[PDB]
Swiss-Prot record:
The protein's name: Protease 3C
Source organism (scientific name): Human enterovirus D68
Domain named Peptidase C3: residues: 2-180
Localization of this protein: Host cytoplasm
Coiled coil location: none
Oligomeric form and interacting partners: Interacts with host IFIH1/MDA5; this interaction inhibits host IFIH1.
Reactions catalysed, as given in the entry: Selective cleavage of Gln-|-Gly bond in the poliovirus polyprotein. In other picornavirus reactions Glu may be substituted for Gln, and Ser or Thr for Gly
Lineage of the species this protein comes from: Viruses, Riboviria, Orthornavirae, Pisuviricota, Pisoniviricetes
Superkingdom, taxonomy of origin: Viruses
Active site residues per record: H41 (for protease 3c activity), E72 (for protease 3c activity), C148 (for protease 3c activity)
Chain's role: Major viral protease that mediates proteolytic processing of the polyprotein. Cleaves host EIF5B, contributing to host translation shutoff. Also cleaves host PABPC1, contributing to host translation shutoff. Binds and inhibits host IFIH1/MDA5, thereby inhibiting the type-I IFN production and the establishment of the antiviral state. Cleaves host MAP3K7/TAK1, resulting in inhibition of TRAF6-triggered NF-kappa-B induction. Cleaves host TICAM1; this interaction allows the virus to disrupt host TLR3 signaling. Cleaves host IRF7, resulting in inhibition of type-I IFN production.
Length: 182
């Protein structure tokens, strides 16, 4: 509808796939080459389904900060025959707050879904499903089951992936440039 959804749509149309684990279907953001991200609660194994294709997982790494606290980001490397558009230049370098954000989801159940979630706060610490978690972004939208892995964007930046909510608020794990240095 506007420049926010334009940027969001540009990421979704080239840099997402539908990831299916034993824990269900997830929006999965492809970052560069064969490297993608997914919430750690997806419990990625040796085999994953990517747009319903059986795919070997060449590596999977659940990120923690240096305090050894959960970040809820799993970085996956896929035995796929195609590379993602390199979008690492859209990733913030530092933790920050953001004014106008869109949350974008693409699953079987929720195709082509875009949510104007508004202002994004650098929340920091969250007890997420009982797990102490760092580097959390908070927006005031009643987000629901099926939205985890959802990509949080502002015009010009990919700032996080949706990892949970409490019925009033949604929460995203920050994406930072330094996660995807090669």
């Amino acid at each position: 509808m506007g420049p926010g959804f334009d940027f969001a749509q540009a990421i979704m149309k080239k840099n997402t796939v539908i990831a299916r684990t034993e824990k269900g279907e997830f929006t999965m953001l492809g970052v560069y080459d064969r490297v993608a991200v997914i919430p750690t609660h997806a419990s990625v194994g040796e085999i994953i389904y990517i747009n319903d294709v059986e795919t070997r997982v060449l590596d999977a790494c659940a990120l923690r900060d240096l305090t050894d606290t959960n970040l809820e980001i799993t970085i996956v490397k896929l035995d796929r025959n195609q590379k993602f558009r390199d979008i690492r230049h859209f990733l913030p370098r530092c933790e920050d707050d953001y004014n106008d954000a869109v949350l974008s989801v693409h699953t079987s159940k929720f195709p082509n879904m875009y949510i104007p979630v508004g202002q994004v706060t650098n929340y920091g610490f969250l007890n997420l499903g009982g797990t102490p978690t760092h580097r959390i972004l908070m927006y005031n939208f009643p987000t629901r089951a099926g939205q985890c892995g959802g990509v949080v964007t502002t015009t010009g930046k990919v700032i996080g992936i949706h990892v949970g909510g409490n019925g009033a608020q949604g929460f995203a794990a920050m994406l930072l440039h330094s996660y995807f240095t090669d």
